[PDB]
Amino acid sequence: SNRTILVTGATGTQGGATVRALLARGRPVRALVRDPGTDAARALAAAGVSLVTGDLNDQASLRAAMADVHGVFSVQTFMTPGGLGAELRQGRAVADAAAATGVRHVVYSSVGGADRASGVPHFETKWTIERHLRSLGVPTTVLRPTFFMDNFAAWGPQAVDGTLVVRLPLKPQTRVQLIAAEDIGVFAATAFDDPDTYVGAALELAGDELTGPELAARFGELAGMPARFEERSLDEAAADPWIPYSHEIAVMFEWFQTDGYAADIAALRARHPGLRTFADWLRAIGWRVP
């Protein structure tokens, strides 16, 4: 009264996962979408999500969408034509709308290390959004995901004559923390239902921590194929015409090499005993070789 959560990015990977986790806890869910006729929008409706049609970049539409809601899940991506500037404006606009409409709890998806002066441009934008939320005093839980399993499956492994080759700008011993989008959903929904524990918290999220060689072995094990890891230079990775936002990704990998994530996996698994390992996750999403 009212218990509804507005989920931004509801048709994307994190927002979609958050919708599922919320429905699994019996929260009512609302999403603001530009076109409710898409397959993704229609799938939300079939799941019981209330769709409001509108553009969230219209301030008034965003406020209208927050009418009577308890909470908002706020997530943006830099991977649009408006890039980091567009991301920043949208993140701050969601925050402003929440403050204006009396939203009781925002869960904001940031990034692990956002608070550690990484210098990674897309981390720094999320930090700026965190600071803005804090300045407004809206009750907030910040989730700071580590490396998404979901995106490092789409460009990591390549089949080369029957061997799976993971070629990334990591040293063979560089450990990388990873998180399933499904678990971001779990923690968002958990946060809304336990504000005493979660309001004012910022939690770095990982379900696994693996090297390049270990990642390759997991793909190969599932696929029934030999696998190997090969280091590539940061310069080579940065300049790759086939990797979207290659230069930005290379800056991020250099930060994995120099600094890296700091989630407390054990603490997270204590709270969420089903926290996915990479092996868990691969099997559950039926990963296939491209």
Place this chain on the structure above:
Amino acid sequence: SNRTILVTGATGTQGGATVRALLARGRPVRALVRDPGTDAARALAAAGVSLVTGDLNDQASLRAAMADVHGVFSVQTFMTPGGLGAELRQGRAVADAAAATGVRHVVYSSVGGADRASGVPHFETKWTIERHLRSLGVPTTVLRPTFFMDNFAAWGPQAVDGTLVVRLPLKPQTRVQLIAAEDIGVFAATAFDDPDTYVGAALELAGDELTGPELAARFGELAGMPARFEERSLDEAAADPWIPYSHEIAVMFEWFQTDGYAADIAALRARHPGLRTFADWLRAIGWRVP
């Protein structure tokens, strides 16, 4: 012995200005360019600049270009297809090359407020580059330009039936500090010839500080036309399809509204009595209505 300065971005506005200022003080100047056959490259050669042909994004080429040089002028732009990630990598690579080749003095072009946690994505990249330079211990002067006169002439004013209209996302009373690229050159060259005063310094640079209405009046006065200023919203400016990097520019203008530059114009004019006002500058570059 040796007195040569390597100027990065030598064919661009700041690097070009820096070349002129250095030649005016009798420094030898070197530039690394991908194609020495361009009009811009050939103009540098005619001015007495030694061209080395190569790509600066090749580490070895960049080190080679710094052989025996005294100093390096380091400048990058986010306005390329590789965006802020590409800028960051290049800025850090110039710094690394300078450290490796024993360069005695780097002058780095940052941005006013880079040090004040602006949250503006392209300011934050320059701050990250500053921090990297500082970490390497290479003797450095940081120049932090304010709003370039040279770019706010290319998109500010528009002729509408014989009236010049400056339409920007500023409140009519918002004061903006501005700087001529020519003066960045002057301060870079001055820094190399006075290391005692300039090494370890970071100087915010402006030659004028004006409101929107004042900017319009200056364009109109030169052009012999009536002029006026009109505020537009940040949202409208951000979403403009005809402004490249519109969203990023709107984030920057919002920072002009909330925070703004802090150069000490009087102190700068004491050092450089020819520091250009906007009126000075317009007249000198023969600005024309588009």
